[PDB]
């Protein structure tokens, strides 16, 4: 066989330890899922520093806690705009997930609160910016560098999927690189806690699994497809399926054909053919052996999964250190709080 007794016993013991970890993680998650935290700070606890972005119903501001001096990324959502845009359930769900999960590679919700006009999610601030800019600047990551980030996503999805959470928006744009060089997953706006199938057309075109496009119901295996896309893009510098327009991208995704740069290792190509597998009965992450088909693949043979989880592996890249006040530029607008409560009933749970 492939393994002698010692290797076989080591792998068995490792897999049993994962089970015990996930059982504890689920009990912790469910307590917070069933009794969410609410109203854990207020706006005048913070100084506003800079608007970092804006959206159709909200914006993100760099803020500083007045007493501790800690910096945070505060999402401000206008309740009336959330209602007008029909985003009540998504906003409530995103905050409920964020306050319940706990994992070293997930952005943390440190505080949340609401007032007459707005909802506030006070997030950990990662000044090194996202993987997207680093990847486009460097061009591509070497396979060891890509593997270091991929391993963190594998563990994060192992965690999230054990909680029946599907993430549904993996892409470099949603991955920050912290000051130790480790990944922080952000933006749980499309995440959903469901145990079977679901049907929503959501995600980003280049990262959509075929079964999302084909209007099948789909399951957590779409995240493993998206991991394939991410690894390919990290290692190549461009994604496996692209075109001028999304419809042409979808044709390529469902075709069952992917081509690889000549510098991809054989091991990498094998892993990607098993993740970018249109046939769900064959896709890694979706088989009898679950995540282990991925974690035990030859491309990950040098990966010490526990050392990654414990953050003891030396990162391949440390973003340039600047200072949490350092920080594209946006116009500054006031935070108007009405003297009348808006949309109170709709957001009772927040």
């Amino acid at each position: 066989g492939h393994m002698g007794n010692a290797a076989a016993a080591k792998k068995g013991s490792e897999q049993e330890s994962v089970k015990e970890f996930l059982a504890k993680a689920k009990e912790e998650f469910l307590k917070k899922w069933e009794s969410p935290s609410q109203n854990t700070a207020q706006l005048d606890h913070f100084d506003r520093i800079k608007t970092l972005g804006t959206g159709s119903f909200g914006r993100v501001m760099l803020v500083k806690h007045k007493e501790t001096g800690n910096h945070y990324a505060m999402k401000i959502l206008d309740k009336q705009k959330v209602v007008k845009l029909k985003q009540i359930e998504h906003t409530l769900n995103e905050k409920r997930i964020l306050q319940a999960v706990n994992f070293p590679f997930l952005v943390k919700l440190e505080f949340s609160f609401k007032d007459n006009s707005n909802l506030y999610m006070v997030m950990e601030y990662v000044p090194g910016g996202e993987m997207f800019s680093h990847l486009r600047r460097i061009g591509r990551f070497s396979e060891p560098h890509a593997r270091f980030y991929a391993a963190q996503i594998v563990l994060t999805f192992e965690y999230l999927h054990s909680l029946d959470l599907i993430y549904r928006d993996l892409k470099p744009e949603n991955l920050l690189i912290d000051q130790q060089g480790y990944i922080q997953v952000t933006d749980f706006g499309f995440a959903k806690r469901v145990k079977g199938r679901t049907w929503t057309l959501c995600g980003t075109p280049e990262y959509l699994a075929p079964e999302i496009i084909l209007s099948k119901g789909y399951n957590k295996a779409v995240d493993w497809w998206a991991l394939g896309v991410l690894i390919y893009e990290m290692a190549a510098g461009y994604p496996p399926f692209f075109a001028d327009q999304p419809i042409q991208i979808y044709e390529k995704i469902v075709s069952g054909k992917v081509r690889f740069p000549s510098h991809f290792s054989s091991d990498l190509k094998d892993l990607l053919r098993n993740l970018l597998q249109v046939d769900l009965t064959k896709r890694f992450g979706n088989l009898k052996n679950g995540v282990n088909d991925i974690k035990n693949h030859k491309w990950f043979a040098t990966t010490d999964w526990i050392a990654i989880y414990q953050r003891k592996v030396e990162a391949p890249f440390i973003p340039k250190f600047k200072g949490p006040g350092d920080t594209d530029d946006y116009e500054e607008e006031e935070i108007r709080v009405s003297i009348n409560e808006k949309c109170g009933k709709e957001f009772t749970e927040f």
Partner: peptide, 18 residues
């Protein structure tokens, strides 16, 4: 080349969700 095709695609920047 594939890389040139990627540049020509107009989808080298941040990608929005659908």
């Amino acid at each position: 080349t594939t890389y040139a095709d990627f540049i020509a695609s107009g989808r080298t920047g941040s990608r929005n969700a659908i």
